[PDB]
RNA sequence: AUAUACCGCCAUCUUCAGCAAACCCUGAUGAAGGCUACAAAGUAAGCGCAAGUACCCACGUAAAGACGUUAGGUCAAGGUGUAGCC
């Protein structure tokens with residue numbers, strides 16, 4: 251009968267009202283639409299790009315809004331069902347922000363040099379009975395040589411769903427929920443951290459509410 | 468077990484096929500969330516490729532009508548000492564003043580561009 | 594290369610005891626001696642026949658407690674009290690053990706003509722210091 | 726008789742630093758390969774150097790120096806397979 255605290259959110263669409271945390275104006279002022287140049291583009295990001303202004307590409311914010319809805323819904327549902335959400339980035343200007351965001355929530359953050367086999371040779375590297383993360387959220391999909399991160403391939407190899415902010419120079423290919431958006435501006439990255447932190451915290455408090463209600467019932 | 472073939476399909480397709488066969492006995496935590504709210508595109512591997520012949524990107528260049536006059540303004544009356552702010556929404560630069568006044572007269576009813584330009588030039592001079 | 598008392602490295606599956614593991618350059622730096630007889634000091638006469646009897650004892654007790662001596666013996670020699678302290682395993686029956694103790698206990702007394710005493714020390718399995 | 730069957734005990738590179746179980750990734754899942762600390766797939770038990778010991782110091786000298794190389798040296802130190810003599 252606990253299949254009502256693990257099946258109910260899954261028939262309510264937007265069970266966590268995550269649709270009231272972001273608007274195409276909030277994103278526009280966070281400067282999410284600003285992308286890279288036509289010379290740093292990706293063929294697979296071409297379907298998400300509104301167009302090019304002065305050889306500087308811009309991302310379609312309606313598509314960003316729909317993708318961000320789906321992403322934040324998924325993140326809220328995994329945080330409710332008590333997964334492990336690992337936030338991965340290689341920025342160096344936002345490492346402090348991502349680790350502090352994980353610690354203000356209760357999820358985890360890899361912001362440092364990804365050692366080979368972290369998710370793949372995981373039992374040998376950590377211990378025989380380790381729980382690998384049930385959702386990896388990349389705030390920046392590229393590494394510091396401007397190439398896709400090992401984790402995006404190894405998360406897929408290990409069948410861990412991935413939510414990721416894909417900019418113009420990124421490969422939205424092996425990312426389950428791509429969110430077309432700027433990740434080079436402090437306001438944009440701050441808004442992403444704020445949105446994901448709020449989703450995860452609201453999800454965990456709602457999980458506690460339904461467990462309390464069913465325990466009293 | 469699991470399928471570490473990241474290239475054949477998606478994590479959803481691989482996991483669904485393996486739990487149908489009966490080798491993944493427990494379903495993962497994320498499978499029902501995927502089956503409830505799937506993404507707009509299943510994450511299947513696609514190899515990037517270089518366009519070679521007469522293949523061009525579908526991305527267009529953003530050009531509005533005001534830019535015909537914007538380009539003309541900078542040409543004659545260059546960028547003034549009134550500097551752009553950019554940090555504040557609703558910033559109305561001097562060139563924006565010019566295009567708004569010019570577009571005003573246009574709506575009112577004028578015809579040749581040079582006459583339009585001199586009239587809005589005296590208008591901003593006032 | 595030096596090949597004196599050095600058990601070479603196999604593949605990491607070779608049980609080996611402290612004694613066998615240490616090489617001859619650790620002979621009293623880490624190991625010590627398996628036979629404590631006084632003849633090898635500065636002034637004494639009979640050290641040669643002590644060693645001739647020493648190798649005899651090692652091989653007699655090796656063939657008389659067949660396949661139960663875990664590691665090698667400690668042939669100490671104070672007064673006329675030769676001692677054959679042992680580390681013998683726990684597989685054969687205790688009546689057989691006490692028998693070979695008595696048999697040796699008297700036979701080396703009548704071979705060497707002095708008190709000879711065996712103080713066995715039973716151990717479950719042959720010990721492993723490291724796997725080489 | 727065969728060191729070209731060997732144990733044993735050594736020479737030599739070595740007045741070296743490598744040899745590596747077990748995994749993982751890359752190469753369209755080929756022989757193979759796995760580097761960037763403002764970091765791009767490598768993680769590593771074990772042996773070796775190192776460390777600790779001997780001599781007068783922490784210096785120097787000793788000892789030590791793996792995996793393998795050279796069918797390198799010895800059936801004559803001893804033991805010994807194979808073939809032989811009685």
Ligand SMILES: C[NH+](C)c1cc(NC(=O)CNC(C)(C)C)c(O)c2c1C[C@H]1C[C@H]3[C@H]([NH+](C)C)C(O)=C(C(N)=O)C(=O)[C@@]3(O)C(O)=C1C2=O
Nearest residue numbers: 726727728729730736737794795796797798799800807808
């Ligand atoms: C004729 N060659 C092919 C040969 C044959 C045998 N043994 C046999 O084939 C005999 N086999 C039978 C007994 C019939 C079963 C051999 O046994 C040998 C050798 C080569 C020698 C060469 C030696 C030589 N030494 C004496 C100065 C030399 O130049 C070196 C060296 N590295 O300095 C050697 O390698 C040598 O010493 C050597 O090992 C040989 C043989 O052992």
Ligand SMILES: [Mg+2]
Nearest residue numbers: 594595735736
């Ligand atoms: Mg030497």
Ligand SMILES: [Mg+2]
Nearest residue numbers: 787788789790
């Ligand atoms: Mg030397």
Ligand SMILES: [Mg+2]
Nearest residue numbers: 774775776789
């Ligand atoms: Mg040393």
Ligand SMILES: [Mg+2]
Nearest residue numbers: 728729796797
């Ligand atoms: Mg030869």
Ligand SMILES: [Zn+2]
Nearest residue numbers: 417419433434
């Ligand atoms: Zn970027």
